Amino acid sequence: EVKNDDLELALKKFKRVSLEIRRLAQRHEYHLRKGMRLREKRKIAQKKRRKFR
Amino acid sequence: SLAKLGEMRTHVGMVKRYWNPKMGFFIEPERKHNNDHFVLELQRQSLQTAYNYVKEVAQNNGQILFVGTKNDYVKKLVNNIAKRVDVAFITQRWLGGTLTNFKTLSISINKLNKLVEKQAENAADLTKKENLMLSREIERLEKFFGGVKSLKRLPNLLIVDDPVYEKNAVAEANILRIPVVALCNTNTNPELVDFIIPANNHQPQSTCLLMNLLADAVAEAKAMPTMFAYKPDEEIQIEI
Amino acid sequence: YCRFCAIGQLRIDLIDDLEALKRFLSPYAKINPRRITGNCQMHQRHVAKALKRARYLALVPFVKD
Amino acid sequence: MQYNIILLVDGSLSLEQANQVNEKQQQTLTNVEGLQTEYLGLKELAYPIKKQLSAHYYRWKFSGDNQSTKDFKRTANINKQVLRELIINLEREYGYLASINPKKQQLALQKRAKYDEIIARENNPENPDVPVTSGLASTQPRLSRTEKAQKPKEELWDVVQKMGNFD
Amino acid sequence: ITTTKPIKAHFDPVADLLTKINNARKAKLMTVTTIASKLKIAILEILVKEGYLANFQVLENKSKTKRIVTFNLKYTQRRIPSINGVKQISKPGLRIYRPFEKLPLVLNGLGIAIISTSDGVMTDKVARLKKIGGEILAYVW
Amino acid sequence: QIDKNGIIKSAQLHDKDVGSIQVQVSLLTSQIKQLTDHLLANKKDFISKRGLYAKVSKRKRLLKYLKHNDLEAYRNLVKTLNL
RNA sequence: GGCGAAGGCGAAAACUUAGGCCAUUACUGACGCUUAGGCUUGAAAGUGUGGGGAGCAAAUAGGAUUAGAUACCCUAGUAGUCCACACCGUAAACGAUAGAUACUAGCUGUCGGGGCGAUCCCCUCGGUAGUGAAGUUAACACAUUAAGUAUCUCGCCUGG
């Protein structure tokens, strides 16, 4: 992921890509079952589909 | 004239395909381009039948209620009718206990008359803010009961801007099983009026056509003036 | 503008679409869903298989970009 | 079932060595060895496979049922110079119908008309026009004829009519 | 006529017949079309004789390539159907045969009870006049 | 592989039939042969033996039909192979 | 969003493979569904063999709260995860709606299929849903993907 843009605002753009990386990787840091994994993922997806769009 | 093609004009465009199919019984196949059309032979025959029916009904010195509370169009139409007629009329849409009982209307209209007399009298008896308060509250009373102050018996006939729109009007009209005429579109069902006259209301051209025809059908009952009942020529007007 | 099922050739596996994949998948390593590019069930499944095969082709890195 | 070898050589080395490795790989067929060279050019590999960032892509057509797919896959995983050993096949799940074959030109007419140089642009990507000229309605052809019709009256139900004349 | 679409059943005309009949009963449909059989034609003709039916036609493709019967549901000028309840008494898995001594009316007498005694479907009162009994097919009132 | 239409056309005892009871049971039997070299090649695919039971029950029902409805339509049958 | 019998299925490559979606004028011809019999799977936990185990974690050890922690909290670890083998047979195996079955408002869709054009808006049939008519429910509500309504079969209950 290239971030060579400017000498002072690179971290500001780094924030959003870090947020995307987190939100795609926010489920592999603990033990859990498949059912709650699918439940949380699909519920968050259909909740974002209904409010922000 | 009556049941002649010269009246109807600009019957294009409805809501966005959100409706019930009961209209399909009495209307030609709807256009899928959101612009449902109403073949005018059925509209003209229904106009003739409804005109004769309500004329006969109102010839018996029955009471009529001219209430249409759409955005601005039918409101202005019924207000022009009211300033043209002596029959009762309501500028706005009421709230509850109007046709299901008269006790609720009784106190409201009695205090409306009392406050009319008060505003005719109260100019220095009270304070300035209290007087302005009474003026605004009598305006509020008159906007909902501008015709209730001219009748004791409930109207024997009425019209509505859209039966779905005035849910209270049709609800308390259907508390008893009574005849009614109205404007109905492809969206509603034919159980909301005992003699259906389906056409357009989205363009104002058809709305004013049907509304003035309905008003003028009962207009010539008590020897009262008329603008659109038998005129072969029509005037094109926009949302007012 | 919708990107597949809108200009889609119905056959998106490896046919000279490398630049499109590099634009369909932004250089920040994310496959676009049907929610943005608008690709249909057909187009989205074939794009998914093609992109994961390109991942298994090192044309697009698995985790880098 | 015919198959397609997408074959690779170490990095961007000389093309003669690439062809030699290609021939060496193509000597290991089981069925008839009718095959041709289709040089797909030099394409990059973003991450190393066998310590080569790029590779010369070659295409080979061969015929079998299930003979030389797994064997080639494994022997090219072992092979140092061959990074990827893609096995493609005519099994490619999309329409091969005659109602998309002329429309392939229309597919070109997509891109051809996705850009239009004119003073006032007359074209828009995916703009509804309803140019529909013909249809099928997915209907099953069947005819009939009336056999015997008795009591043929269907009452002409009147207009919506309840609680009429006030008198 | 031109239908250009097939009509399906479970394994016998009774199933889809009564399916469509009750579909018209609840959903208030003006006309119905189902497959053709002797029972439907006979009952339609007998209700024509008793005065209970709208228009009805039997349709064939050539001779058996598709046999169907279509019939309008008779309503009134105020759209009140002439039928005030229709229900089969005999079913494929429930067939009942009653002698002429055991042929009742509908509710009190409100409808016509049709019995196939020995040569076809015909009415209860004259069935007892002829003193021949059989299948009480259904109750219509 | 599948050997559905080739074995149908090869074994069309009537003038032209790709869905007669004869050719349908031959189709089912050829398909269970194909599914048997499936379960030899893919053992854990028990869905294949489930479909095997489904198709064999269907064909035995079809054979009972071929016996009772058309009294001698099952006489020319040479399928439902060795038990 | 699709498929798969629920069970479930997603780095790819390939292997074989079936169900299936539309149009089949058609290919036949009442085989159509049915469950007790009979025939298979059934998650995972767990059983056992051998490897193998990067990883963590039932029980357990210790540290923390505690009236104590078999708790929340943490550092290890046994099986537990993997591969193949067989077993395992219960599940929110929930349409909390048996199968198939025949059609039944609208509605916005959405996907696949068949005719169309630039993909698109178009018609149709099936897959993916409910707002809601009628019908059916104690009420929510099922409702064109029935709890509507025809046909058959079967299992499941008669209060604790």
PDB file of C-alpha atoms in Angstrom, chain F residues 11-69:
ATOM      1  CA  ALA F  11     -30.951 -48.459 -27.179  1.00  0.00           C
ATOM      2  CA  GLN F  12     -34.025 -46.735 -28.645  1.00  0.00           C
ATOM      3  CA  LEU F  13     -36.221 -49.813 -29.070  1.00  0.00           C
ATOM      4  CA  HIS F  14     -39.108 -47.573 -30.170  1.00  0.00           C
ATOM      5  CA  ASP F  15     -39.026 -45.270 -33.203  1.00  0.00           C
ATOM      6  CA  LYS F  16     -37.734 -42.225 -31.289  1.00  0.00           C
ATOM      7  CA  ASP F  17     -37.714 -42.064 -27.485  1.00  0.00           C
ATOM      8  CA  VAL F  18     -35.324 -40.274 -25.131  1.00  0.00           C
ATOM      9  CA  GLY F  19     -37.692 -40.389 -22.150  1.00  0.00           C
ATOM     10  CA  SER F  20     -39.592 -43.655 -22.440  1.00  0.00           C
ATOM     11  CA  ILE F  21     -39.627 -45.976 -19.425  1.00  0.00           C
ATOM     12  CA  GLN F  22     -37.212 -48.289 -21.254  1.00  0.00           C
ATOM     13  CA  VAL F  23     -34.684 -45.583 -22.080  1.00  0.00           C
ATOM     14  CA  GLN F  24     -35.219 -43.845 -18.724  1.00  0.00           C
ATOM     15  CA  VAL F  25     -34.375 -46.961 -16.713  1.00  0.00           C
ATOM     16  CA  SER F  26     -31.389 -47.564 -19.005  1.00  0.00           C
ATOM     17  CA  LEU F  27     -30.367 -43.954 -18.307  1.00  0.00           C
ATOM     18  CA  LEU F  28     -30.687 -44.569 -14.570  1.00  0.00           C
ATOM     19  CA  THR F  29     -28.631 -47.777 -14.726  1.00  0.00           C
ATOM     20  CA  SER F  30     -25.867 -46.181 -16.809  1.00  0.00           C
ATOM     21  CA  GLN F  31     -25.830 -43.257 -14.396  1.00  0.00           C
ATOM     22  CA  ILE F  32     -25.438 -45.592 -11.402  1.00  0.00           C
ATOM     23  CA  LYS F  33     -22.527 -47.233 -13.195  1.00  0.00           C
ATOM     24  CA  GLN F  34     -20.998 -43.757 -13.557  1.00  0.00           C
ATOM     25  CA  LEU F  35     -21.785 -43.028  -9.889  1.00  0.00           C
ATOM     26  CA  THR F  36     -20.251 -46.345  -8.857  1.00  0.00           C
ATOM     27  CA  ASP F  37     -16.932 -45.473 -10.437  1.00  0.00           C
ATOM     28  CA  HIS F  38     -17.502 -42.162  -8.652  1.00  0.00           C
ATOM     29  CA  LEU F  39     -17.689 -43.836  -5.238  1.00  0.00           C
ATOM     30  CA  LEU F  40     -14.685 -45.911  -6.224  1.00  0.00           C
ATOM     31  CA  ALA F  41     -12.912 -42.672  -7.190  1.00  0.00           C
ATOM     32  CA  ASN F  42     -14.549 -40.549  -4.417  1.00  0.00           C
ATOM     33  CA  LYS F  43     -15.450 -42.672  -1.384  1.00  0.00           C
ATOM     34  CA  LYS F  44     -16.441 -39.953   1.115  1.00  0.00           C
ATOM     35  CA  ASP F  45     -19.059 -38.628  -1.350  1.00  0.00           C
ATOM     36  CA  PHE F  46     -21.938 -40.479   0.305  1.00  0.00           C
ATOM     37  CA  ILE F  47     -24.379 -38.172  -1.497  1.00  0.00           C
ATOM     38  CA  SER F  48     -23.578 -40.404  -4.468  1.00  0.00           C
ATOM     39  CA  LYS F  49     -24.765 -43.574  -2.717  1.00  0.00           C
ATOM     40  CA  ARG F  50     -27.806 -41.606  -1.523  1.00  0.00           C
ATOM     41  CA  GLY F  51     -28.648 -40.687  -5.112  1.00  0.00           C
ATOM     42  CA  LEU F  52     -27.834 -44.296  -5.992  1.00  0.00           C
ATOM     43  CA  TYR F  53     -30.570 -45.487  -3.631  1.00  0.00           C
ATOM     44  CA  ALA F  54     -32.916 -42.787  -4.932  1.00  0.00           C
ATOM     45  CA  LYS F  55     -32.488 -43.767  -8.581  1.00  0.00           C
ATOM     46  CA  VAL F  56     -32.639 -47.514  -7.940  1.00  0.00           C
ATOM     47  CA  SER F  57     -35.877 -47.144  -5.960  1.00  0.00           C
ATOM     48  CA  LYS F  58     -37.269 -44.978  -8.771  1.00  0.00           C
ATOM     49  CA  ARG F  59     -36.305 -47.535 -11.423  1.00  0.00           C
ATOM     50  CA  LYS F  60     -37.745 -50.480  -9.495  1.00  0.00           C
ATOM     51  CA  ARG F  61     -40.986 -48.518  -9.179  1.00  0.00           C
ATOM     52  CA  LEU F  62     -40.776 -47.791 -12.920  1.00  0.00           C
ATOM     53  CA  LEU F  63     -40.273 -51.520 -13.572  1.00  0.00           C
ATOM     54  CA  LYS F  64     -43.288 -52.446 -11.445  1.00  0.00           C
ATOM     55  CA  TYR F  65     -45.126 -49.943 -13.632  1.00  0.00           C
ATOM     56  CA  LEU F  66     -43.681 -51.457 -16.820  1.00  0.00           C
ATOM     57  CA  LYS F  67     -44.964 -54.825 -15.600  1.00  0.00           C
ATOM     58  CA  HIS F  68     -48.472 -53.961 -14.434  1.00  0.00           C
ATOM     59  CA  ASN F  69     -49.632 -51.212 -16.813  1.00  0.00           C
TER      60      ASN F  69
END
